[PDB]
A = this chain, B = another copy of it.
Amino acid sequence: RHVVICGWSESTLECLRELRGSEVFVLAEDENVRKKVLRSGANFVHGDPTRVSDLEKANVRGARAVIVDLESDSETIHCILGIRKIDESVRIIAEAERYENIEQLRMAGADQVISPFVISGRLMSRSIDDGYEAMFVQDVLAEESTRRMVEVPIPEGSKLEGVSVLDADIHDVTGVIIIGVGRGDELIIDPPRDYSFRAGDIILGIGKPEEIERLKNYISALVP
């Protein structure tokens, strides 16, 4: 369903570009952004992201997720708490500008924290001789390039449910590179040949559309 974004910045703008076709509500105090927000395809809700009543009129309750990106560390936390007073289920992803705050966001109830500068800093250190690593990260994330990164859940009653990674041989079968498996908020990279896929497991891979579609079929569940 719908996604709510609290605040506005270059990150959320790029995020909207990726969420077009999806119903998105942007709640922010700076009306100067209404134009850009509306152009970007999102519904603009003028209001205070740290206020429960405004979060509510922004349709936070029942949202699929709420992305929080406010300049103030304090406001981000107050926003998180406000969201939590409305809906305890909704996934909350918060942007952090300082490493020192990542845990306070966690404490407040954020399910995930994205730190643009940690990522930027590491790409800088990895780009001293060439930019292949930076290129990788950018390519696999560029919505529609030769090969892209995707995640596919292993549905209940999946064809591979109970099968081993070795027995699966997903790469030779589909052509998709398996970079990891997500299970219970934990990512297992390059799992042992004896790792057995289970429903709910999330497969992270890199491949072409055809290869991806092939993976979807290979992971489909045996049900009418």
Contacts and interface: CB of A to CB of B under 8 A. Distances in A.
Contacts of A179: 136, 177, 179, 206
A177 B204 contact: no
A65 B129 CA distance: 7
Interface stretch (A14-22, A28-36, A47-55, A212-220): A14-22
Interface residues of A, number: 71
Label chain A's interface by main secondary structure: mixed
A132 B185 CA distance: 8
Contacts of A134: 112, 114
A12 B99 CA distance: 13
8 contacts: A14-B117, A14-B122, A64-B128, A67-B127, A116-B120, A119-B120, A177-B189, A179-B206
Interface of A: 3, 9-19, 64-65, 67, 69, 91, 93, 95, 97-99, 111-112, 114-143, 146-147, 149, 151, 175, 177, 179-180, 182, 185, 187, 189-190, 202, 204, 206-207
